[PDB]
């Protein structure tokens, strides 16, 4: 139980993680199926017990690196898996290793997922934080006040379009 | 506005942990590498479609503690701070009326549902406290009873009718916001534009998985039943048919999702236009920001989309 | 404004000459088209299950009835490689077409006129625009009016002079603590209240937030002629 193994049963084969669950099978059943014709449960041919089949963890691997002109310090994100193979921090996107989490919120420099973003900042290292959405500037309000400008500024921005 | 981000390992879907299969797949070229680049390019667009729509303002705004908006009650639109999820009573209805292991993996979104509401609330507090000014620089305080006086002038109506009939305007407004709750809670077909976006994707994913069980002219759809049954030089023939069939099923999925990302990228570019001309201002375009003479608009988030509340005269 | 404008044009040279990433929208276009062709030529080196990728190594090596089968696999592989190329370029052309129809909408609405659409022809109150060509694209220089320095004032929707309610024709009332003035909403240009700046409608016992102040008639001092 709780290990990625292979399956060789009387009426079932495959590869995945086996574990006990609360599923209920028929008296003459040997194996179940999910919505898409893929097995996710099986009964022990010898004992009366039903064990779910969770396939082994898999997911893409991605690196969080700043520019090569800055440093070679790099973190790694194992997408969609809890920390198995492992400066470690679990996110809702995966196990991020090589980055130190901080409670201070900043602007998103390098996106990761689930609101998390990284950045190379100060003895410099890579950090991970919940990205901020800008500073709060709750303006005054009342039934009798108004704001009127006294000066202005002529801005000239730029816009590219293929 | 956005779609469900997906990515597919083109090695595990076709060759389910088989050394003989991966060796034959290596000779087909870079079809495997190309498909990951397309889906990876799609998933990045779904994060831009939210920035170009919700992140119209860098500065966050908040309402004052004394909600004196001149007879107008925005309680059903503004967030409930007493809740754990900072969303309004109307957003609660939209987030409830809208209802694998073969290499298929769903990547999460960059911005969470709590992050979207911080933007949606910032635009409400600006449109209420400032109106059209925070969309053109620094926010300027203007009371709400005086906002509508300008918005009434912008549609060819002198501002005498507002101050003389504030009680009627405020009751018609609050009475109308209440009907939106009853309509959304009763009629399920209101969120049909967003429900098709989810069902259309799941139909393609479930069809992608059902294509694995097909034989494609071979002795069987399983690899173990071929390598453990037939000789090497004969299994290579049967395996080559599945690789050609399973690979054509991916290109049909990618080519479809690559077209659906255009219909969604055109709708997101519209919603970004409506979150600027209608919300951060007053539009003179007919029937663009609602039927009738336009006064103002109030956005509300939703799963993979937006919901505008167009006030009209 | 002339010094503000000319100073801003100088910043454009500094931003475009220093940061090359400003034109990432146009460089990603030529890069995607290049990856397709480079991937299209790499497909020629693949066998697609045949004996060899080269035709001469099959025609000058094998017999007709056995070569026709190996030759067919390369055709079926290289033909699908073209369909994947032509299919993608038809989708890329749709994105570039939507961008051109937008740029035509901006060259007509922003350059050839003045746009009242918010955040369409640049952030702020739009005055004019100036196109500049570029490889496979355009570059718009949107001139905009942005108010910067603010000042809190006390306002009111109306003023009661002698029983009649006085609303402003154009602008809004303000107060420096002691006197009431009319001023344009987007620039502080205070003026004295008078019958030319305001108009009458109704009485004072209806409007909410109304105040009491004097409305000057220009024909009053003329009585002392």
- Interface A–C counts its CB contacts (< 8 A) at 118
CB contact under 8 A, C157 and B146: yes
CA distances (Å), origin B44, targets A112, A129, B37, B139: 11, 20, 11, 32
Q: Resolution in Å, one decimal, please.
A: 3.2
Which of A151, A157, A160 is facing C26, going by the closest CB pair?
Answer: A160
The closest of A100, A105, A104 to A124, measured between CA atoms, is: A100
Task: Give C56 to chain A, closest Cα distance, Å.
Answer: 41
Which of A143, A148, A160 is facing C151, going by the closest CB pair?
Answer: A148
User: Which residues make Cβ contacts (< 8 Å) with residue C112, sequence separation at least 6?
Assistant: none
Strand B294-302, strand B104-105: pairing? unpaired
The closest of B149, B155, B144, B140 to B67, measured between CA atoms, is: B144
Strand A75-79, strand A61-64: pairing? antiparallel
The answer to whether A88 touches A79, Cβ cutoff 8 Å, is no
The answer to whether B108 touches A116, Cβ cutoff 8 Å, is no
Chain A positions contacting chain C at CB under 8 Å are: 140, 143-162
- CA–CA gap between residue B4 and residue A156 (Å, rounded): 38
User: Which residues make Cβ contacts (< 8 Å) with residue C208, sequence separation at least 6?
Assistant: B70, B145, B163, B166, C157
Our separate counts of H helices and E strands in chain C read: 4, 9
Which of C87, C90, C118 to probe the B interface (max B CBs under 10 A)?
C118
- CA–CA gap between residue B276 and residue C67 (Å, rounded): 64
Geometric angle at alpha carbon A106, from B53 and B269, rounded to 5° = 10
Contact C89/B at CB under 8 A: no
- CA–CA gap between residue B236 and residue B227 (Å, rounded): 9
- CA–CA gap between residue B170 and residue B72 (Å, rounded): 5
Residue written as token pair 């290793």: A97
CB contact under 8 A, C118 and B135: yes
What does chain B come to in residues? 313
Residue A121: both structure tokens together: 């900042």
The answer to whether B203 touches A29, Cβ cutoff 8 Å, is no
CB contact under 8 A, A151 and C122: no
Residue written as token pair 């509401």: B117
Each as own residue / partner, the long-range contacts of residues A113-119 (CB below 8 Å, 24 or more positions apart, any chain) are A113/A79, A113/B107, A113/B108, A113/B109, A113/B110, A114/B108, A114/B109, A114/B110, A114/B112, A115/B110, A115/B111, A115/B112, A115/B115, A116/A91, A116/A92, A118/A64, A118/A75
Which of A96, A136, A137, A140 to probe the B interface (max B CBs under 10 A)?
A137
> For residue B140, which residues of chain A lie inside 8 Å, CB to CB?
146-149
- CA–CA gap between residue B6 and residue B13 (Å, rounded): 14
CB contact under 8 A, B28 and C77: yes
C59-78 burial: b if 16+ Cβ within 10 Å, else e: eeebeeeebeebbebbeebb
Task: Give B129 to chain A, closest Cα distance, Å.
Answer: 7
CB contact under 8 A, B140 and C119: no
> For residue B122, which residues of chain A lie inside 8 Å, CB to CB?
133
What is the Cα gyration radius of chain B?
26
Helix (H, G, I), strand (E, B) or coil at B67: coil
- Burial class from Cβ neighbours inside 10 Å (0-12, 13-18, 19+) for residue B286 reads exposed
Method: cryo-EM
Strand B305-312, strand A88-90: pairing? unpaired
The answer to whether C174 touches C122, Cβ cutoff 8 Å, is no
Sheet of A100-101: strands edge to edge?
A100-101, A125-130, A116-121, A110-113
B213-240 burial: b if 16+ Cβ within 10 Å, else e: eeebebeebbbeebbeeeeeeebbebbb
> For residue C202, which residues of chain B lie inside 8 Å, CB to CB?
160, 164
- CA–CA gap between residue A8 and residue A3 (Å, rounded): 15
């Amino acid at each position: 139980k709780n290990k990625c193994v292979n399956f060789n049963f009387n009426g079932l084969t495959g590869t995945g993680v086996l574990t006990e669950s609360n599923k209920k099978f028929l008296p003459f059943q040997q194996f179940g199926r999910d919505i898409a014709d893929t097995t996710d449960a099986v009964r022990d041919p010898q004992t009366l017990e039903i064990l779910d089949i969770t396939p082994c963890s898999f997911g893409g691997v991605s690196v969080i690196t700043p520019g090569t002109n800055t440093s070679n310090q790099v973190a790694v994100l194992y997408q969609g898996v809890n920390c198995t193979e492992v400066n470690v921090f679990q996110t809702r996107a995966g196990c991020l290793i090589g980055a130190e989490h901080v409670n201070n919120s900043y602007e998103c420099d390098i996106p990761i997922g689930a609101g998390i973003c990284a950045s190379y900042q100060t003895s410099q290292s890579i950090i991970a934080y919940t990205m901020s959405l800008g500073a709060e500037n709750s303006v005054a309000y009342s039934n009798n006040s108004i704001a009127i400008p006294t000066n202005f500024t002529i801005s000239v921005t730029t816009e590219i379009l293929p | 506005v956005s779609m469900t981000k997906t990515s597919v390992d083109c090695t595990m879907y076709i060759c389910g942990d088989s050394t003989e299969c991966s060796n034959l797949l290596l000779q087909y070229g870079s079809f495997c590498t190309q498909l990951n680049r397309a889906l990876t390019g799609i998933a990045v667009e779904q994060d831009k479609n939210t920035q170009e729509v919700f992140a119209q303002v860098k500065q966050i705004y908040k309402t004052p503690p004394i909600k004196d908006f001149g007879g107008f009650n925005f309680s059903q639109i503004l967030p409930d701070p007493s809740k754990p999820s900072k969303r309004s009573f109307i957003e609660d209805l939209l987030f409830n009326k809208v209802t694998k292991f073969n290499g298929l993996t769903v990547l999460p979104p960059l911005l969470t549902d709590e992050m979207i509401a911080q933007y949606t609330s910032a635009l409400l507090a600006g449109t209420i406290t400032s109106g059209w000014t925070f969309g053109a620089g620094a926010a300027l305080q203007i009371p709400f009873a005086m906002q509508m006086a300008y918005r009434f002038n912008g549609i060819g109506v002198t501002q005498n009718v507002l101050y003389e009939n504030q009680k009627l305007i405020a009751n018609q407004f609050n009475s109308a916001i209440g009907k939106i709750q009853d309509s959304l809670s009763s009629t399920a077909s209101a969120l049909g534009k967003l429900q098709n976006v989810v069902n259309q994707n799941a139909q393609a994913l479930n069809t992608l998985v059902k294509q694995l069980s097909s034989n494609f002219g071979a002795i069987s759809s399983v690899l173990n039943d071929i390598l453990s049954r037939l000789d090497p030089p004969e299994a290579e023939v049967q395996i080559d048919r599945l690789i050609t069939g399973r690979l054509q099923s991916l290109q049909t999925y990618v080519t479809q999702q690559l077209i659906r990302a255009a219909e969604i990228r055109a709708s997101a570019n519209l919603a970004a236009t409506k979150m600027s001309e209608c919300v951060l201002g007053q539009s003179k375009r007919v029937d663009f920001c609602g039927k009738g003479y336009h006064l103002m608009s109030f956005p509300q988030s939703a799963p993979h989309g937006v919901v505008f509340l167009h006030v009209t005269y | 404004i002339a010094n503000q404008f000319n100073s801003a044009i100088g910043k454009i040279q500094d931003s475009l000459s220093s940061t090359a990433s400003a034109l990432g929208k146009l460089q990603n276009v030529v890069n995607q088209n290049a990856q397709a062709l480079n991937t299209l030529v790499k497909q020629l080196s693949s066998n697609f299950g045949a004996i060899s990728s080269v035709l001469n190594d099959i025609l000058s090596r094998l017999d007709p009835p056995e070569a026709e089968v190996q030759i067919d696999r390369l055709i079926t592989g290289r033909l699908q490689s073209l369909q994947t190329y032509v299919t993608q370029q038809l989708i890329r052309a749709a994105e570039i077409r939507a961008s051109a129809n937008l740029a035509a909408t901006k060259m007509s609405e922003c350059v050839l006129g003045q746009s009242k659409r918010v955040d369409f022809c640049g952030k702020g109150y739009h005055l004019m625009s100036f196109p500049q060509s570029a490889p496979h694209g355009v570059v718009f220089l949107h001139v905009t009016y942005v108010p910067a320095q603010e000042k809190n004032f006390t306002t009111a929707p109306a003023i009661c002079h002698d029983g009649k309610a006085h609303f402003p024709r154009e602008g809004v009332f303000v107060s420096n603590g002691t006197h009431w003035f009319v001023t344009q909403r987007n620039f502080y240009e205070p003026q004295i209240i008078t019958t030319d700046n305001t108009f009458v409608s109704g009485n004072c016992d209806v409007v909410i937030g109304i105040v009491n102040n004097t409305v000057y008639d220009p024909l009053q001092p003329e009585l002392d002629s």
